[PDB]
Amino acid sequence: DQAGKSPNAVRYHGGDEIILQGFHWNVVREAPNDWYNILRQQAATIAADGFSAIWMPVPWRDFSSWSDGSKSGGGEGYFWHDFNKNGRYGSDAQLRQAASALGGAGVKVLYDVVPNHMNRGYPDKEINLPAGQGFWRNDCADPGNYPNDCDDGDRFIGGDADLNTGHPQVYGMFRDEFTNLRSQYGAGGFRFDFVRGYAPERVNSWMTDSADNSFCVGQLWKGPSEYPNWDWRNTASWQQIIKDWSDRAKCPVFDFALKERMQNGSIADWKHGLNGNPDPRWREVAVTFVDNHDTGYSPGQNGGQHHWALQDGLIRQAYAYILTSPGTPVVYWDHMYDWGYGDFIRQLIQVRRAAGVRADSAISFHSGYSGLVATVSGSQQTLVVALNSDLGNPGQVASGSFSEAVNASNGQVRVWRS
Numbered sequence: 001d002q003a004g005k006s007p008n009a010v011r012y013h014g015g016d017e018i019i020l021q022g023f024h025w026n027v028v029r030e031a032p033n034d035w036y037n038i039l040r041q042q043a044a045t046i047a048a049d050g051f052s053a054i055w056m057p058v059p060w061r062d063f064s065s066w067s068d069g070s071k072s073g074g075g076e077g078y079f080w081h082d083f084n085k086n087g088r089y090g091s092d093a094q095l096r097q098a099a100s101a102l103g104g105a106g107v108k109v110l111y112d113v114v115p116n117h118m119n120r121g122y123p124d125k126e127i128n129l130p131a132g133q134g135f136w137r138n139d140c141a142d143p144g145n146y147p148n149d150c151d152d153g154d155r156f157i158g159g160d161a162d163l164n165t166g167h168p169q170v171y172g173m174f175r176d177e178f179t180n181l182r183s184q185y186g187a188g189g190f191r192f193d194f195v196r197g198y199a200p201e202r203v204n205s206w207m208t209d210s211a212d213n214s215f216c217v218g219q220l221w222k223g224p225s226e227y228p229n230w231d232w233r234n235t236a237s238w239q240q241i242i243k244d245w246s247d248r249a250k251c252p253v254f255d256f257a258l259k260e261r262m263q264n265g266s267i268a269d270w271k272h273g274l275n276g277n278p279d280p281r282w283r284e285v286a287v288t289f290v291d292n293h294d295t296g297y298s299p300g301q302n303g304g305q306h307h308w309a310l311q312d313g314l315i316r317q318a319y320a321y322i323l324t325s326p327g328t329p330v331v332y333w334d335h336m337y338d339w340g341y342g343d344f345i346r347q348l349i350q351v352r353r354a355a356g357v358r359a360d361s362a363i364s365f366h367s368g369y370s371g372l373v374a375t376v377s378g379s380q381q382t383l384v385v386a387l388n389s390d391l392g393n394p395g396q397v398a399s400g401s402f403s404e405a406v407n408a409s410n411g412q413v414r415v416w417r418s
């Protein structure tokens with residue numbers, strides 16, 4: 001588990017991370033004020049299960065609230081009112097103990113940070129940016145969901161809570177908080193939220209200033225069709241759009257190309273995610289996932305958000321895929337500890353580890369069989385992966401002696417290793 005930036009100075013922190021998304025959407029409602037306490041107690045098991053990092057929820061307190069139709073929400077962290085750590089997940093003191101316990105067990109803690117907007121309208125907060133000083137996107141004329149003079153990116157919904165991240169004083173505010181998270185809360189890196197709401201270069205700057213050598217990941221969720229007609233991106237692939245962001249922020253990016261293929265393509269089409277790209281410079285910057293707090297289910301109310309959920313009969317296949325392939329994989333809290341995929345994932349993580357699969361490992365796709373058949377070249381062993389495939393045996397696609405590593409779902413999930 002080394003460190004170092006990629007050959008392109010991209011902050012993938014050694015290319016051998018295995019991340020646990022340390023929360024689900026309904027945590028504030030299912031274990032109110034008690035999440036840091038649970039993470040603290042489970043620190044030893046997370047480390048033993050094989051994760052080298054954990055994506056923690058937004059540490060900034062959120063007392064927001066909404067009701068839309070028959071749904072309600074708030075306090076999850078994405079509509080924060082100040083940097084005070086005494087929120088819905090637990091107290092400042094409890095966060096410090098969780099971070100320490102996690103760090104102590106060998107799991108780097110990555111905080112989710114939301115620079116785009118804040119709960120501008122909350123009455124009792126410690127940050128008060130008055131209007132008319134250029135601190136807000138809406139301090140400038142705001143025609144549409146396009147960059148204006150006060151906000152160099154898209155806006156969140158109405159844009160009325162969007163910050164001018166480029167304003168010297170705002171940039172500085174975030175900068176110092178990132179430094180704070182790092183030296184007082186054990187930050188080993190950050191997950192940048194809603195990266196489409198502000199310039200990618202600003203992310204590069206923040207990291208340069210506070211955590212140059214840490215890990216970073218940006219959440220860019222914007223399809224080709226969201227860009228203007230005359231924009232090069234309007235007719236670009238999902239890979240291109242996200243690679244472009246990663247080149248500019250110098251941070252790994254969530255593989256929405258893969259997610260898109262998982263949702264709308266067939267299993268054989270998964271070789272079209274950013275992680276399957278034949279150029280190591282492209283692959284190695286992908287941060288793969290099966291579902292997250294937005295896309296997937298969560299225990300509790302409404303089944304969570306489930307905006308782009310994976311078909312239930314592909315969950316094991318999806319995990320065998322991300323866990324044996326290039327890019328940096330992210331495991332969803334619930335699959336691991338709530339829905340019983342624990343044993344299955346532990347297995348795959350051990351296979352990834354023994355094989356020495358890393359972010360830039362080579363992967364080749366075989367086309368003469370049904371499903372997905374891939375040969376992954378780990379630094380230690382070669383993996384042959386067959387998902388929902390009629391492949392007979394590894395020898396049909398690769399030379400050398402093979403031993404079965406995994407065999408689940410009726411032969412639907414098969415992995416062999418040299």
Ligand SMILES: OC[C@H]1O[C@H](O[C@H]2[C@H](O)[C@@H](O)[C@@H](O[C@H]3[C@H](O)[C@@H](O)[C@@H](O[C@H]4[C@H](O)[C@@H](O)[C@@H](O)O[C@@H]4CO)O[C@@H]3CO)O[C@@H]2CO)[C@H](O)[C@@H](O)[C@@H]1O
Nearest residue numbers: 064065066074078079156157158159160161193194219294
């Ligand atoms: O003042 C600004 C706006 O305030 C009001 O907006 C509401 C939305 O209507 C609610 O739906 C909600 O927003 C959630 C959102 O549903 C939820 O998915 C989550 O969003 C994140 C996402 O998880 C994350 O991964 C990321 O990439 O981006 C999203 C934004 O960070 O969190 C949102 C915020 O809690 O709450 C807001 C604010 O309460 C109002 O309806 C709008 O008119 C108005 O402009």
Ligand SMILES: [Ca+2]
Nearest residue numbers: 001002013014
């Ligand atoms: Ca590392």
Ligand SMILES: [Ca+2]
Nearest residue numbers: 154155162197
């Ligand atoms: Ca914005």
